[PDB]
C-alpha cells in the first residue's frame, strides 16, 4: 500500500506515535517519506546482508526475522514480512521498541540526515488530526 501523507498521519496517530518518546507526528511522517516514500512494500538490502522492511525501513539485524540475516537478533519477535502489510500495527509496535532503545529517532539515518532540525510540522499540514 502506498499511503497518502494525511492517511499515514491518521494511522500513526491511532497507533500512539504522536509525541511517542517525545517525537511529534510530523517527525514520523517525514521519516516514512524519506525511508519508503510511503510504500508499505519497500525493501532495501544492505551490504551487511540485512534487509530494511516497510514504511519505516526496519532492519533484520536486530528487530525482525527474515531467515537470511546471519548472527541477527529478532528483538520485535515478528517475521520481517509482517512489516510489509497494508496494516501498520506491527511496524508501529516495532518502531516504539526501536525509538525506546536509547538513540531515539537517530536509529533512522534518513530522519537524522533529512528531517532532524527541519520544519517537520509541514508534513502534517492540512491533515484532520
Stretch that binds Pt ion, among 8-16, 36-44, 106-114, 115-123 (CB under 5 A): 8-16
SS3 123: helix
Binding of Pt ion by 61 (CB under 5 A): no
Q: Rounded to the nearest whole angstrom, what is the least distance from the CB of residue 86 to Pt ion in the complex? A: 8
Mark whether 7 is an active-site residue.
Answer: no
Contact positions with Pt ion (CB under 5 A) in 14-53: 15
Stretch that binds Pt ion, among 13-21, 23-31, 38-46, 47-55 (CB under 5 A): 13-21
43-to-24, 52, 59 alpha-carbon distances in Å:
25, 5, 10
Question: Given 18, 35, 66, 87, which residue is catalytic?
Answer: 35
Q: What are phi and psi of 59, to 5 degrees?
A: -100, 140
* DSSP code, position 84: G
- Count other C-beta atoms under 10 Å from residue 22's C-beta: 9
Task: Say which residue the cell 525493501 belongs to.
Answer: 43
Binding of Pt ion by 11 (CB under 5 A): yes
Task: Say which residue the cell 499540514 belongs to.
Answer: 125
Can you give the binding site for Pt ion, defined by CB under 5 A?
Answer: 11, 15
Q: Where in the sequence numbering do the catalytic residues fall?
A: 35, 52
Amino acid at each position: 500500500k502506498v499511503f497518502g501523507r494525511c492517511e499515514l498521519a491518521a494511522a500513526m496517530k491511532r497507533h500512539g506515535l504522536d509525541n511517542y518518546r517525545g517525537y511529534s507526528l510530523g517527525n514520523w511522517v517525514c521519516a516514512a517519506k524519506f525511508e519508503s516514500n510511503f510504500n508499505t512494500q519497500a525493501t532495501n538490502r544492505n551490504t551487511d546482508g540485512s534487509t530494511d522492511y516497510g514504511i519505516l525501513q526496519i532492519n533484520s539485524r536486530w528487530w525482525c526475522n527474515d531467515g537470511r540475516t546471519p548472527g541477527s537478533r529478532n528483538l520485535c519477535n515478528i517475521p520481517c514480512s509482517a512489516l510489509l502489510s497494508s496494516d501498520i500495527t506491527a511496524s508501529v509496535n516495532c518502531a516504539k521498541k526501536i525509538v525506546s532503545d536509547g538513540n531515539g529517532m537517530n536509529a533512522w539515518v534518513a530522519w537524522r540526515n533529512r528531517c532532524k532540525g527541519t520544519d517537520v510540522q509541514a508534513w502534517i499540514r492540512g491533515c484532520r488530526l
